[PDB]
Design a protein around this ligand. Structure first.
Ligand SMILES: CN(CCOc1ccc(C[C@H](Nc2ccccc2C(=O)c2ccccc2)C(=O)O)cc1)c1ccccn1
Ligand SMILES: [Cl-]
Length: 276
């Protein structure tokens, strides 16, 4: 391998994406792991590990109050539902801002830009959610709370099924030990998929993804020298991301049919509309 104009341009591309990733996503993997491993000495997340602690964390986590004369299981489900919805809407905006910085993206046909974001955002959301997870739980509300996996799993059906595929993915994904510099290129690779349904100009997207893939391959070689076949293993993880989306869509459809007063935010409806 040589540090020639080709590879140097790949490094400059990796740096450009890292810088735009830092600008677009306030809570990076580096900051989240610091919090999760207790490196933040003064301010620490409140832990939500059961019903009692969820209701004691209402103020810190922006949850509507739950009085003692309500169906506790139902109201908690609503709070978690609204909480995830708020976060997803914010996350779409961060990813959209990020995508505009991907070299070549803004030059694509505007309809193809929208199609790529439509099919990409949720896969990126689940990838970056893993940065905020360990086997115990997930950081929420800008890292001010930590909600446990078993608590999310105990919610009344169908709500208690929602997060488990995300945690199972995160544990395997986090064992790859990627850092923010790796992730910035990987999420660009997710976006620039030439196989999204309804793309008009496939060739310009593939040429960009080919370049991103080259950048990711070089990044992993330089940053993880003794991690054998890390590139291959990371690409296989895209298989799991797509299944997360598939199951999540199905669970949301159960909610649309068998639940009241939990309609999706309009932006999320537009993303899910005619998706696959
Ligand atoms: C666990 N979590 C971290 C963020 O988790 C996410 C988990 C999933 C998502 C994606 C997002 N999900 C929803 C969007 C709208 C309404 C509900 C959901 C749920 O996902 C949901 C549904 C039923 C029961 C529970 C959740 C999407 O599809 O756009 C985005 C974020 C929380 C929890 C409470 C408050 C804030 N943070
Ligand atoms: Cl290594």
């Amino acid at each position: 391998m040589q540090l020639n104009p080709e590879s140097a341009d790949l490094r400059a591309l990796a740096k450009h994406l890292y810088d735009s990733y830092i600008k677009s996503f306030p809570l990076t993997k580096a900051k989240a792991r610091a919090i999760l491993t207790g490196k933040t000495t003064d301010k620490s997340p409140f832990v939500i590990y059961d019903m009692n602690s969820l209701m004691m964390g209402e103020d810190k986590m922006k949850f509507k109050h739950i009085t003692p004369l309500q169906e506790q299981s139902k109201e908690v489900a609503i709070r978690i539902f609204q909480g995830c919805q708020f976060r997803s809407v914010e996350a779409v905006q961060e990813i959209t801002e990020y995508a505009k910085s991907i070299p070549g993206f803004v030059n694509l046909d505007l309809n193809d830009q929208v199609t790529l974001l439509k099919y990409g955002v949720h896969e990126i959301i689940y990838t970056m959610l893993a940065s905020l997870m360990n086997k115990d739980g997930v950081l929420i509300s800008e890292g001010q709370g930590f909600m446990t996996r078993e608590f999310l799993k105990s919610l009344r059906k169908p709500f208690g099924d929602f997060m488990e595929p995300k945690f199972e993915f995160a544990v395997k994904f986090n064992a790859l030990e990627l850092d923010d510099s790796d992730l910035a290129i990987f999420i660009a690779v997710i976006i620039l998929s030439g196989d999204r349904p309804g793309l008009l100009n496939v060739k310009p997207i593939e040429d960009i993804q080919d370049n991103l893939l080259q950048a990711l391959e070089l990044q992993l070689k330089l940053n993880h020298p003794e991690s054998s076949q890390l590139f291959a293993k990371l690409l296989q993880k895209m298989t799991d991301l797509r299944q997360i989306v598939t199951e999540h869509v199905q669970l949301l459809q159960v909610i649309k049919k068998t639940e009241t007063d939990m309609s999706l935010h309009p932006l999320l409806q537009e993303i899910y509309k005619d998706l696959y």
